[PDB]
Amino acid sequence: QADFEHAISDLEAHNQAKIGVALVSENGNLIQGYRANERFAMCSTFKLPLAALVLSRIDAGEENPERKLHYDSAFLEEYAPAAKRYVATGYMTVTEAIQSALQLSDNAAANLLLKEVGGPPLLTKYFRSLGDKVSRLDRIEPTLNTNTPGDERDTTTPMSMAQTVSKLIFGDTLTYKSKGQLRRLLIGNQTGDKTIRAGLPDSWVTGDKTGSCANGGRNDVAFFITTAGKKYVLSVYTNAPELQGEERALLIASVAKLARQYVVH
Amino acid sequence: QADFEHAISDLEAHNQAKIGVALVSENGNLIQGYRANERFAMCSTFKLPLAALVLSRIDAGEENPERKLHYDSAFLEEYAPAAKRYVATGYMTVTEAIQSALQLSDNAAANLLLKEVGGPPLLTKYFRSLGDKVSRLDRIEPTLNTNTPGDERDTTTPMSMAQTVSKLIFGDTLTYKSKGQLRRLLIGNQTGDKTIRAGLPDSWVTGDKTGSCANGGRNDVAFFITTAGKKYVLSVYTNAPELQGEERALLIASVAKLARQYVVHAH
Numbered sequence: 001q002a003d004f005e006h007a008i009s010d011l012e013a014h015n016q017a018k019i020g021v022a023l024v025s026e027n028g029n030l031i032q033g034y035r036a037n038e039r040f041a042m043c044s045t046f047k048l049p050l051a052a053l054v055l056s057r058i059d060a061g062e063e064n065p066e067r068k069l070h071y072d073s074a075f076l077e078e079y080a081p082a083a084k085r086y087v088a089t090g091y092m093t094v095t096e097a098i099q100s101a102l103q104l105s106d107n108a109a110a111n112l113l114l115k116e117v118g119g120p121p122l123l124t125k126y127f128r129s130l131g132d133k134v135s136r137l138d139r140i141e142p143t144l145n146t147n148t149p150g151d152e153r154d155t156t157t158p159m160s161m162a163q164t165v166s167k168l169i170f171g172d173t174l175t176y177k178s179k180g181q182l183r184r185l186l187i188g189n190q191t192g193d194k195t196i197r198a199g200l201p202d203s204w205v206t207g208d209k210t211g212s213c214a215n216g217g218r219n220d221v222a223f224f225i226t227t228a229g230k231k232y233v234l235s236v237y238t239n240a241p242e243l244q245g246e247e248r249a250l251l252i253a254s255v256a257k258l259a260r261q262y263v264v265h
Numbered sequence: 266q267a268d269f270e271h272a273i274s275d276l277e278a279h280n281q282a283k284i285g286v287a288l289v290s291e292n293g294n295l296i297q298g299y300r301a302n303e304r305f306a307m308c309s310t311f312k313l314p315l316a317a318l319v320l321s322r323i324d325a326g327e328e329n330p331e332r333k334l335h336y337d338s339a340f341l342e343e344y345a346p347a348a349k350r351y352v353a354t355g356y357m358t359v360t361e362a363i364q365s366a367l368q369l370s371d372n373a374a375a376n377l378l379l380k381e382v383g384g385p386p387l388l389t390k391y392f393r394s395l396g397d398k399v400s401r402l403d404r405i406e407p408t409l410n411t412n413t414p415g416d417e418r419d420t421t422t423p424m425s426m427a428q429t430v431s432k433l434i435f436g437d438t439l440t441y442k443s444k445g446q447l448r449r450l451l452i453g454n455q456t457g458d459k460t461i462r463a464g465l466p467d468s469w470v471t472g473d474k475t476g477s478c479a480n481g482g483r484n485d486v487a488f489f490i491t492t493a494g495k496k497y498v499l500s501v502y503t504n505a506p507e508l509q510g511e512e513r514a515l516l517i518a519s520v521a522k523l524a525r526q527y528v529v530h531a532h
């Protein structure tokens with residue numbers, strides 16, 4: 001505990017960074033943390049709960065995975081690599097939007113889903129319905145990434161998001177079908193190979209969602225399953241303005257690698 | 266014909282490249298071509314017909330999109346971004362493998378599917394069944410990318426692949442359901458934003474499969490639909506050993522830009 005904390009502190013000082021981390025068990029209990037209850041910007045980590053909300057509306061018969069979400073170039077965003085590919089067709093399905101939002105972090109895809117669930121206020125409501133008293137969305141993409149110090153819009157804490165993610169992935173509020181879909185989608189994430197996953201062994205099942213924002217923000221939340229079958233969530237939130245991008249990912253990987261050491265013990 | 270062909274020759278000479286190209290209409294008829302009947306290595310363009318073969322088996326009730334294809338690290342390849350993510354779980358579904366092979370060009374995923382259809386011989390048989398007398402697969406990933414001059418293993422022609430792709434996308438061999446799935450997967454391809462698509466307007470629906478190989482090989486085949494609702498396929502095969510990677514993609518985009526200029530006139 002003492003050791004894990006001093007290790008993260010050393011990483012802060014070496015990198016002139018701020019790091020928040022929570023490692024939780026299947027049931028949401030804190031195993032190890034550092035600044036676990038400090039507020040950070042979600043950045044794109046919000047897309048994981050967003051996808052769960054959409055899945056919960058499918059579960060409730062309020063949404064259909066093949067429903068066409070019609071849009072045109074007016075709905076594009078600067079970072080929207082899938083939506084730009086599909087725009088000439090005039091739509092993406094709910095399914096395609098979920099996959100794009102999760103595995104590519106597509107901002108237009110995420111905005112399409114936000115539109116269909118009732119916008120950031122309804123994602124906040126969703127967080128509260130899960131027992132997450134902290135996490136909140138307020139803005140749509142891309143303005144939710146400003147990461148201004150002291151601004152509580154669009155924020156979580158490492159503990160809260162770790163506990164929310166553990167509930168979604170290992171808990172039972174989603175149907176078994178949706179829970180399975182979410183897990184396989186996260187495992188297939190394309191943006192997290194240099195982040196938490198780079199600090200975990202390849203033999204562990206891992207799924208994650210990254211975030212990147214202004215003021216040097218770089219985040220990742222992952223679930224993983226060890227070879228002994230034990231289940232965890234690791235949230236890692238960082239602000240590292242003095243680091244270059246590859247160095248920001250290495251910092252998260254470094255955190256994961258320290259977590260790996262604790263899990264093994 | 267003349268203007269188009271001279272534009273491509275110009276590109277060859279400017280880039281010390283070899284380029285083959287076929288632009289075909291919906292029904293496979295050649296609109297414009299340059300070296301359209303010369304052989305080139307398919308490289309990863311083969312993964313488009315591979316996916317169609319798998320969908321044809323689904324259509325026939327011989328395959329199931331949710332079937333788990335079990336594998337372990339012994340199945341991984343050097344370029345296998347998706348399969349490496351899923352390997353701890355022990356499998357990928359047929360659907361996951363199709364999506365990964367198409368949109369990422371994942372080599373392990375393609376090899377998983379090849380195993381389930383009977384391997385390169387049966388993909389070649391599928392080509393034949395479609396009326397493509399030329400295209401052939403002989404090796405699995407990654408050795409199929411050697412692109413050695415005069416080696417006919419793992420080769421097609423720009424016209425053969427254009428016609429095969431137009432049959433698969435716009436013809437009757439796949440069910441409506443499977444045709445739509447294939448199309449939407451190709452439209453979401455993640456590796457073609459700087460190749461054919463970069464030369465076509467944003468308003469045209471485009472879906473594509475790229476290929477990259479040794480000896481400067483860089484390929485792309487795409488279907489597109491203009492705003493008038495006319496349907497085409499464009500296949501572009503290039504060997505450009507003297508260019509850097511980004512320049513190889515720009516060469517393909519430049520070909521597609523010439524095809525665009527032509528299609529607009531035709532319309």
Ligand SMILES: [Cl-]
Binds near residue numbers: 077078079080081084
């Ligand atoms: Cl983009």
Ligand SMILES: [Cl-]
Binds near residue numbers: 330360363446
């Ligand atoms: Cl499919």
Ligand SMILES: [Cl-]
Binds near residue numbers: 369370456475477
């Ligand atoms: Cl590639």
Ligand SMILES: [Cl-]
Binds near residue numbers: 456475476477
């Ligand atoms: Cl490729």
Ligand SMILES: [Mg+2]
Binds near residue numbers: 330359446
């Ligand atoms: Mg399928």
Ligand SMILES: [Mg+2]
Binds near residue numbers: 370456477
């Ligand atoms: Mg590649």
Ligand SMILES: [Mg+2]
Binds near residue numbers: 309370476477
């Ligand atoms: Mg490739």
Ligand SMILES: [Mg+2]
Binds near residue numbers: 460483513517
């Ligand atoms: Mg290229």
